[PDB]
Ligand SMILES: CC(C)(COP(=O)(O)OP(=O)(O)OC[C@H]1O[C@@H](n2cnc3c(N)ncnc32)[C@H](O)[C@@H]1OP(=O)(O)O)[C@@H](O)C(=O)NCCC(=O)NCCS
Ligand SMILES: CC(C)(COP(=O)(O)OP(=O)(O)OC[C@H]1O[C@@H](n2cnc3c(N)ncnc32)[C@H](O)[C@@H]1OP(=O)(O)O)[C@@H](O)C(=O)NCCC(=O)NCCS
């Protein structure tokens with residue numbers, strides 16, 4: 001069974017509201033009219049009234065909720081709260097009226113205030129433009145130094161990871177993580193694995209080196225980050241530096257890194273930077289026939305996800321479903 | 333057919349001589365006889381005629397020529413040769429004579445001075461010990477900044493590349509190649525692919541970014557190496573900064589990099605550093621169930637190859653056949 005089928009089913013059990021801002025694109029409506037249709041969640045649409053019922057065509061959205069930045073009965077405290085976290089960044093009140101009238105923003109500040117549980121977009125903008133709303137308004141969770149991105153990778157005939165399932169991170173967002181930032185990526189991705197795959201994360205800090213099989217600036221960066229992460233999170237089994245083969249293969253691990261809590265069992269792969277992360281994941285997907293999921297964001301304070309530039313609405317129902325389960329990571 | 337068999341045949345039609353210095357290892361001798369029996373190459377065994385004779389017992393090594401570094405006709409000219417090379421890097425004439433009694437130093441000089449077409453060692457020495465004389469004696473071909481290590485990769489049920497075969501560089505040796513280094517690795521890799529795989533090289537300078545989809549020091553690096561490589565070798569197909577998906581999958585190349593010489597059909601992967609290179613090759617081998625060949629070295633003035641220390645006498649046969657075809661790039 002599919003990770004996304006598993007997830008979307010778990011996501012139906014919950015009750016969560018997802019504010020989709022891309023209300024001028026007709027995919028973000030094909031998506032919208034299947035959320036309410038399967039019980040995946042409830043879902044806000046952020047944008048002009050003239051768009052909705054006229055654009056998509058004939059699809060039932062009475063189950064949906066329309067809120068325009070210039071219609072809602074609370075729109076005033078949005079130009080105000082935005083101006084409270086841009087309180088240090090040069091933008092006045094009518095500039096806080098220029099930025100906010102955009103749909104992405106209103107969908108994001110609704111999350112910050114708990115009017116909405118989460119946000120999915122990226123499909124019609126990019127991964128530069130999308131994450132600003134996610135950073136400036138939402139900010140991050142407490143046990144989190146940054147917003148990062150990741151991918152769930154399912155490898156077909158595979159006796160590695162968690163039944164062929166892995167989290168790769170960061171493979172989306174963070175171009176050049178510093179050693180501090182890497183260590184945190186490990187910790188935060190462990191909690192995401194647990195949440196989404198529902199298995200014990202064994203986190204591998206990757207490298208061409210394995211426990212000093214080589215030595216350079218590169219290795220030492222990872223070395224350090226392993227050991228930073230091992231402190232941040234003692235309860236989480238975390239090791240580095242590991243090559244991939246030692247990371248996943250008992251026989252190999254047994255000789256390259258004897259008595260490791262991770263080597264030979266890995267299911268979370270952590271990369272030195274985004275050349276590595278993004279190469280690794282595409283290589284899995286295309287040469288290993290792995291199914292890939294993401295980019296999904298993590299370490300955020302309330303879930304807000306990005307989308308591959310070009311995609312279908314069936315992917316979006318996927319993303320919306322993850323934004324739900326994610327949305328059930330703190331409320332307890 | 334498998335890559336290795338293609339290679340062995342070509343080897344047999346060629347007329348190359350390979351030196352084997354690891355003559356106190358019984359796998360080298362076993363490999364030797366197999367290679368002669370089959371017609372894969374001529375052999376110079378470098379070592380002690382009494383010891384080989386005493387070690388070989390039931391092996392038909394009579395087609396081989398045995399050369400003893402301490403009694404060979406040309407000994408004293410090999411020593412001068414080494415002296416000239418290292419004069420200015422501390423070595424004294426005395427020091428030369430002692431270094432040059434090393435079977436493996438001798439065999440590399442043989443190749444340098446034209447008595448052998450290449451050398452295979454590594455079965456009973458570390459890679460550093462094998463690669464030091466290579467890079468000191470035979471040095472590099474015509475000023476490529478450097479020698480590098482590559483893999484030939486065969487993915488099983490793959491449409492991508494050249495029948496799911498690829499060349500990965502550098503995935504085993506140069507750790508932090510400079511921007512120039514990466515440029516050089518691309519050019520040399522393209523010639524190697526053409527030679528060994530026998531198909532038009534189409535080289536992907538890899539990244540997490542496709543056509544300036546993201547900007548950073550990493551991306552700037554890749555672009556600069558892309559741009560220098562095109563200057564270094566204009567008639568070879570080399571492209572921008574490319575993601576793996578944009579590089580091998582024509583439908584994604586149809587989106588992210590239209591009209592590229594490389595994108596959609598890449599078959600040569602150049603990585604930014606050895607984290608990427610190794611992690612990528614290991615994902616391919618382990619999760620993709622790719623067959624992977626060597627680290628094989630390139631960019632030297634004559635082929636020199638290092639084996640794994642747990643190789644079989646048959647792995648040696650194959651390393652010897654790669655090395656002969658590598659030696660076909662020379663000639664006259
Ligand atoms: C424009 C960009 C290249 C410059 O990076 P930046 O200066 O850090 O981010 P921006 O200028 O867009 O926005 C400002 C905020 O974004 C934040 N942001 C970027 N990366 C972050 C991270 N992973 N964790 C938390 N916040 C982050 C910065 O911390 C900054 O906050 P500050 O000004 O109060 O200190 C880039 O952030 C972008 O296009 N955003 C997409 C996300 C991304 O890829 N960022 C990595 C760039 S180094
Ligand atoms: C040992 C090492 C860390 C030190 O670097 P170095 O002193 O510059 O090189 P080494 O001591 O290993 O060997 C001597 C030569 O290697 C050369 N060299 C290093 N990398 C090379 C490369 N990949 N291709 C060709 N020559 C290379 C140096 O120019 C040096 O020449 P010199 O003695 O005439 O000045 C490193 O070169 C090394 O690991 N070399 C062995 C093979 C290897 O693993 N190379 C990876 C390079 S990052």
Ligand SMILES: CC(C)(COP(=O)(O)OP(=O)(O)OC[C@H]1O[C@@H](n2cnc3c(N)ncnc32)[C@H](O)[C@@H]1OP(=O)(O)O)[C@@H](O)C(=O)NCCC(=O)NCCS
Pocket residue numbers: 243245458459460463480481503504505610617624625626627628629637638639640641643647651
């Ligand atoms: C040997 C093997 C099983 C595992 O090796 P590994 O420890 O994971 O190391 P990598 O494959 O990532 O390659 C880097 C290693 O190659 C060595 N190496 C570096 N430069 C090299 C070069 N230019 N040529 C040959 N070896 C080199 C390095 O020393 C390094 O570690 P080492 O000290 O253990 O040798 C691996 O190479 C492999 O998967 N090959 C399978 C069999 C094969 O391809 N045939 C080889 C013929 S002997």
